[PDB]
Design a protein around this ligand. Sequence first.
Ligand SMILES: C[C@H]1O[C@H](O[C@H]2[C@H](O)[C@@H](O)[C@@H](O[C@H]3[C@H](O)[C@@H](O)[C@H](O)O[C@@H]3CO)O[C@@H]2CO)[C@H](O)[C@@H](O)[C@@H]1N[C@H]1C=C(CO)[C@@H](O)[C@H](O)[C@H]1O
Ligand SMILES: [Ca+2]
Length: 832
Amino acid sequence: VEAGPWENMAYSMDSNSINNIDGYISYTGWYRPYGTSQDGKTWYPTTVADWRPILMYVWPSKDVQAKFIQYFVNHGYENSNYGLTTGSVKDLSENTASIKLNEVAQNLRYVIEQHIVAAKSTSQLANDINNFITTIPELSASSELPYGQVIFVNNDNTSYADSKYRLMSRTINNQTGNDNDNSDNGYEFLTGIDIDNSNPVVQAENLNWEYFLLNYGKLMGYNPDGNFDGFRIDAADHIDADVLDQTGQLMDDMYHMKGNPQNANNHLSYNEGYRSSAARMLNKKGNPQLYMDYVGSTLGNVLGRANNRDTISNLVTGSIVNRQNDVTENEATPNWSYVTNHDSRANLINGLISKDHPGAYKAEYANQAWQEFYADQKKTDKQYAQYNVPAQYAILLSNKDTVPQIYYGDLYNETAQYMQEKSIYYDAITTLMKARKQFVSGGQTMTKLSDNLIASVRYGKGVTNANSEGTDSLSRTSGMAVIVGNNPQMAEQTISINMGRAHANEQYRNLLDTTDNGLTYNADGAENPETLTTDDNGILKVTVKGYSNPYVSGYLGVWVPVVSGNQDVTTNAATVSADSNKIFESNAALDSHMIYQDFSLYQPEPTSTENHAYNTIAQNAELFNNLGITDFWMAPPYTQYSESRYNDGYSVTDRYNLGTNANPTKYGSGEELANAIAALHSAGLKVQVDIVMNQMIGLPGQEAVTVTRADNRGIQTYVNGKTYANQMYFAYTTGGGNGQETYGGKYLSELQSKYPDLFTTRAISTGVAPDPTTRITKWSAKYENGTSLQNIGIGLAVKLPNGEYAYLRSSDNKAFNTTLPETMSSADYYAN
Ligand SMILES: C[C@H]1O[C@H](O[C@H]2[C@H](O)[C@@H](O)[C@@H](O[C@H]3[C@H](O)[C@@H](O)[C@H](O)O[C@@H]3CO)O[C@@H]2CO)[C@H](O)[C@@H](O)[C@@H]1N[C@H]1C=C(CO)[C@@H](O)[C@H](O)[C@H]1O
Ligand SMILES: [Ca+2]
């Protein structure tokens, strides 16, 4: 038998003629048989270009084999001379005899080869195979059960991808496991390939990564200054909280923060979270990072809505700090707060999209939403945009026991080129920002006046409460009164504001007041003059009413002491702590800080080198200082997934490549980053990097992994009554770039030498220390909890009829012996 069906065997038994992922074969995959035939008699050898889809030759069961035959005969491949018509195959099924189905399938092969020769290509065949796959539940992508995630699990078939660790949802107070707080503590999975931050080797790699960022410019040989001072921690509610302990440990080891509030405050770190249980967690740990406060939502519900506003009293209570009469130090949870951030603006725009492209797929256009938003922002009767933006900032910037965070997109038109266009709110917000540096310090009292209308008073540096004498020389000339109403039809009336007994018989300047059309900064259109003077007890009598304009819907008024010139009420941090077990303490020295978010998701790509965000912030370094900003939050500077929607930094490909001249990020190059940070340092600011330990989206390398269908907590779940566990999945899991290759684990030896305690301190979740003996030069499933569903499908893995997976040895892959289906391998099969 020199010519025959034995030529269905693979040309060679290796990767050169058989598609495989880690040795495992796919039903969507292709192979090169030795030869092919269009009639059964004449057989021709393949060249290197003549490959065929495996679904012509092998199937997961007799049922699918019969449905393959039936489908192909019904969709173009009918031929009565080879026993293949719509009624000859109509009654085939899984119960049909095996040799009969094999014979019918062999005849179809000949008819397919006739089709191939008629078309001079396999293009139509490839399309028919893909179309057939979608009609089988088990072969299509829909087998993975949208929408959600899968967890990677242990299996001897995917032994390389095994793990002892994968401790899922060890988040916030659930570090130990054991959720007995009846409170929202967050969950492991968000979106993309979830990094196992429970793995000791990964925990060591995070410390490496953090050390790299903290010494960036030095280690790259760029600007020798220009290294990051701290961290904004992304997705802190969705990572094993061990890494929060270990970040704090590293920073304390490097910079000696436990002793000195000065050292702590110069290396400010803060955790992104939308769950109040994080406050408790951080307090128990001595506050290694700042807790993200929820006063933004309160500000939006009370001042920002069009109609159905919450009562003005919500501003005193609706926060991690009660500010009805806040006259103490070191008691409040050290926190950071915001009027807006990049996600808040995004959720506004991404719901305006739902009206413009109604229920449709977004991925395509919608700058029309922004044109609508910009127009709406200028209107009195706003459809979509936030009301009372300046008043929201006035409250945020005058609040005690917090580090306020200003949003780039509230100072600038965020979809324009970087810092090219100022927002309508630039004047109001920057006026309040400079006034903060000059005036706000001391105890806070928020007094309700008429169900709408609240006076928020700060008593000045060294003035603890309303009855105190001043201790500081600036006590007399410091403090602020912020008047905020949220009823645009409020009756015109007079009000009495207690400035404190330290401010008796004192002249106060009208810093900001409301007019018919907007705001005034020299009392021009207002109900009050340029200056008012307190009575003998320090009460200020002021006139107020409802207004309706683009800036104010209700009332906004701000009063500060009359001063001889330049003033600065920033309190310098102590060089010895009050507690010593605490890292951060909510006091006047922390309250003197102020964060600036430098980016938006809707920031454009730069049209020139001069429009690179890093170059623009190098140019404007002194402006940020002049505005009273001392803590610069920079966007994630990492290399991005090319097809990510916003190009923002969160969809990470390479943790260590922050951009080159040839291949910059959205924000610029690494050398530009180093210069930018040095420029900010020269202006007197500290700067922190957005660090993203939760996920890496868009790794290019595929890996054969064993997976189980899970909810966002990483526990197995059911979807419309269906589930699966221990299924083979050909997921995109492997990569990291040349940055990970060259810098991954590079500084673990140095860290071990300098700070041995990093790798002997046992983590709470695991009970073992970070492991510096393995370097992560490349990411793979072994260091991953799982992934969001990748639209590939679960039932493509080729199992043989005996039950075992089909495997192909190939130099890298030596887990098992080579065992392939008889149809494309066994000479002994074809001998019969
Ligand atoms: C995008 C953001 O998603 C997650 O935060 C979610 C909360 O999980 C979710 O509960 C909701 O928060 C509200 C909460 O439900 C409610 O109790 C309270 O009254 O109000 C909350 C705010 O309105 O919505 C937020 C987001 O809108 C994660 O916790 C965040 O880490 C995540 N942001 C990060 C992470 C990624 C990568 O996944 C980036 O896409 C994003 O830009 C970055 O900021
Ligand atoms: Ca996670």
